[PDB]
Design a protein around this ligand. Structure first.
Ligand code: HEM
Ligand code: HEM
Ligand SMILES: Cc1cc(N)nc(-c2cc(CN3CCC(F)(F)CC3)cc(F)c2F)c1
Ligand SMILES: Cc1cc(N)nc(-c2cc(CN3CCC(F)(F)CC3)cc(F)c2F)c1
Ligand SMILES: C[C@H](O)[C@H](O)[C@H]1CNc2nc(N)[nH]c(=O)c2N1
Ligand SMILES: C[C@H](O)[C@H](O)[C@H]1CNc2nc(N)[nH]c(=O)c2N1
Ligand SMILES: [Cl-]
Ligand SMILES: [Cl-]
Ligand SMILES: [Gd+3]
Ligand SMILES: [Gd+3]
Ligand SMILES: [Gd+3]
Ligand SMILES: [Zn+2]
Lengths: 401, 401
């Protein structure tokens, strides 16, 4: 009942005793594994009790006066109101814990270093925009990126939700054609179509930064043009392929996910944008080279004079590596924090060892931790992993429509 | 029924075949163990009955005279003998299905093209050796490799098992060193010790082909040297890096797995080596670049004049790609069948399509189907998969020592 877990590079063995705490049952059964799938009233008191216990164990204060006291207050609050408010410190502790528990995040070595902007007193898309704008400028920090989350008011019954309609705070437009196919980013054709709908003037380019559709409870979403000086971007050049700059490629500095639902102690925050910094493969491999994204791979290969006529020349692999080199080089030249997939995965192994000693295991999703290029060149490839849901958590949620 | 998405195209299918999954895997709703490498007459009869049902379906004779007669023949044999014997055509069908059902095999587009050598009358380790040599000769075919399996006698009450102790028919020795390192292939240290312990005079090169340790029932293993001219090898050179040939690297033509158990309708064949042809990443990425294998990555990158002091130069990614190029070049130069990871994964996508029409699904282990370099450059990366166990099957089994 405690899964044995082996590292095949070293031969070391550990047991994931933490896996025994998994609540929100995942998608797998003894009969079929679904691990490769991307997207698989007073129970509020069970989750609340549990999270409060987590908080006080963490600060070495389980079973001591303030613990009992806080236990009664959430009981009283829920009894009187049907919900409860998180203490500031608990909101901070729960945000870091949800990050720590995110099985697909390779960057969790950083989980203890997170800036939490408490936006629970927020009201109206106007207010959100100032909060999002404060977050972006703090997190960006002139390229010295700092992990941050901004936590908008929790969901209550009867009243609509706070929601950011964009999957991220920075997104590039995707416009169709007189032939269906997309200019810009095909990942965002829908939210581009929703933006143009709600009044935005579409550009023509491949890298038009989209406006934010910000939604206050029970009110129609409102467009918001992001201050162009607040959107830090990196033009993409290559250190030795002089023509690479002429391809006109760019990516933004700040990966800020704004469509996931933060859940702490039973409370649900459908508006809680978190950001950190990029791993270079996210941009150089997935965003630029996925066939359904910018799909630039063959264009770079033609420019490198590679033999695209046979797959066994590995022209795809060669061009992909240089695109990733160009991402890392461009971000370093712009002094915008970035981490390559070797450094990231090596830090994740350290994180696993840390989490083994601290908690007896770590929820990790092998398919997402192993990077999308050179997988077996990184140590996480050779590490067996156990995937499971702990709370608090970041959860996926429906698009607010 | 699991819904399964391809993210590159957007297409969607349901894996109805997974509902028929007999034996149980390691995952539960609590925790996924997908990344782990190594997760009674009445019950033999129900396995036999299902396979016979499978066989008669494939020959468009479900529910027919011969069908019912074969079921009663098997029940009568299990009653009188505690086991039963496969007809030759049932063995051939069962061997192909076992291949077809192997979830970690990316080469399964070929599953119907398989040469089955019926060695079930094999009497000794000496006859076993002759069968193996003929397998190797046929499958190698002077470099135009043909998929084959040789099936030795089934496990049966009262007698010991036939076993091939070697994990493959062709393996390079791994010699523990004076200083505690390994000369040759570190994956083969154990079997190398066993060969020496069993009378083999070791060499001391890095690419010494191992003898075969072959076990007849209730017999100690018996040492057999492979005729050197039966073992086709490919010296490794790089099309443009002429110093690469000076590494003295080599690999062998034939991948022949010899330590897995073939299960057909509840009958177990502990000795049944099968062989196909290599995908270049197996050699270029895993065998040569794994830290715990030949581990040539840094030496190649240094020779390539890469900056190995910083990870963000992507020296590992660059050197690995050229090691894979060298493998592909070398095998094509030697006229030995090999497939690159792009062609192989492209054919596996067609296999998945074929199997969706044929059986309503396909058991696939995403972490093994996705190549160890350039994962998201191949189509399988963007394909959700359902992993489950179908019989007939190749199973892992303990090492006989
Ligand atoms: C600071 C540097 C960070 C790096 C390098 C990093 C890296 C990554 C990567 C590569 C992914 C894969 C997702 C994809 O591309 O599909 C991911 C997912 C994710 N990350 Fe991180 N991240 C960082 C910070 C953070 C922070 C600050 C948070 C939250 C406070 C966070 C929470 C998540 C979540 C929720 C996911 C989705 C996967 C899941 O829920 O299991 N990450 N991260
Ligand atoms: C014809 C060319 C073939 C190719 C290119 C191919 C490719 C592969 C690869 C890359 C793996 C993963 C190996 C690893 O990294 O450990 C694999 C595993 C495997 N293959 Fe194939 N293979 C071929 C033929 C065959 C044949 C002829 C059989 C059996 C008749 C077979 C059955 C298996 C089995 C049993 C595994 C272990 C995984 C599992 O059992 O699910 N393959 N194959
Ligand atoms: C805080 C944070 C840091 C970081 N480095 N990255 C993310 C992140 C980035 C995506 C975008 N990503 C594009 C490539 C893709 F492969 F298409 C999959 C989607 C999605 C997420 F959920 C994420 F958490 C978040
Ligand atoms: C018939 C057949 C064809 C083919 N291309 N390959 C295999 C195969 C090869 C290994 C060796 N392979 C080395 C790399 C590794 F990463 F170490 C993992 C093990 C093991 C297996 F089970 C296999 F079926 C079999
Ligand atoms: C089908 C498969 O699960 C899907 O393509 C996953 C695989 N691994 C991934 N890993 C990361 N980091 N990001 C992703 O989007 C994906 N996609
Ligand atoms: C621990 C991890 O599961 C292990 O390294 C796996 C991952 N995927 C693999 N995939 C293939 N094709 N071959 C392998 O040996 C492995 N090893
Ligand atoms: Cl992104
Ligand atoms: Cl091999
Ligand atoms: Gd020119
Ligand atoms: Gd030269
Ligand atoms: Gd030297
Ligand atoms: Zn699973």
């Amino acid at each position: 009942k405690f899964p044995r877990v082996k590292n095949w590079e070293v031969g070391s063995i550990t047991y994931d005793t933490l896996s025994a705490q998994a609540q929100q049952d995942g998608p797998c059964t003894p009969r079929r594994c679904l691990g490769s799938l991307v997207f698989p009233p007073e129970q509020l008191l069970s989750q609340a009790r549990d999270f409060i216990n987590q908080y006080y164990s963490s600060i070495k204060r389980s079973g001591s006066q303030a613990h009992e006291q806080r236990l009664q207050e959430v009981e009283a609050e829920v009894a009187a109101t049907g919900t409860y408010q998180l203490r500031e410190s608990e909101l901070v502790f729960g945000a870091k814990q949800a990050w720590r528990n995110a099985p697909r995040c390779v960057g969790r070595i950083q989980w203890g270093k997170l800036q939490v902007f408490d936006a629970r007193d927020c009201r109206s898309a106007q207010e959100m925009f100032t909060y999002i704008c404060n977050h972006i400028k703090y997190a960006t920090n002139r390229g010295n990126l700092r992990s941050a989350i901004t936590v908008f008011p929790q969901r209550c019954p009867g009243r609509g939700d706070f929601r950011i309609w964009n999957s991220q705070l920075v997104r590039y437009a995707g416009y169709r054609q007189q032939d269906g196919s997309v200019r810009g980013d095909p990942a965002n054709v829908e939210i581009t179509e929703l933006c143009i709908q709600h009044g935005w003037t579409p550009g023509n380019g491949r890298f038009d930064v989209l406006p934010l559709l910000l939604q206050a409870p029970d009110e129609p979403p409102e467009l918001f043009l992001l201050p162009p000086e607040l959107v830090l971007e990196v033009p993409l050049e290559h250190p030795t392929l002089e023509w690479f700059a002429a391809l006109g490629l760019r990516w933004y500095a700040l990966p800020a996910v704004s469509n996931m639902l933060l859940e702490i102690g039973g409370l649900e925050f459908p508006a809680a944008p978190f950001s950190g910094w990029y791993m270079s493969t996210e941009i150089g491999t997935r965003n630029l080279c996925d066939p359904h994204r910018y799909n630039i791979l063959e264009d770079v290969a033609v420019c490198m004079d590679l033999d695209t006529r046979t797959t066994s020349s590995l022209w795809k692999d060669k061009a992909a590596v240089e695109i990733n080199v160009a991402v890392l080089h461009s971000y370093q030249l712009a002094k915008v924090t970035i981490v390559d997939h070797h450094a990231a995965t090596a830090s994740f192994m350290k994180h696993l060892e840390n989490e083994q000693k601290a908690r007896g295991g770590c929820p990790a999703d092998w398919a997402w931790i192993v990077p999308p290029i050179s997988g077996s060149l990184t140590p996480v490839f050779h590490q067996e992993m156990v995937n499971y849901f702990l709370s608090p958590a970041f959860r996926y949620q429906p698009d607010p429509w």
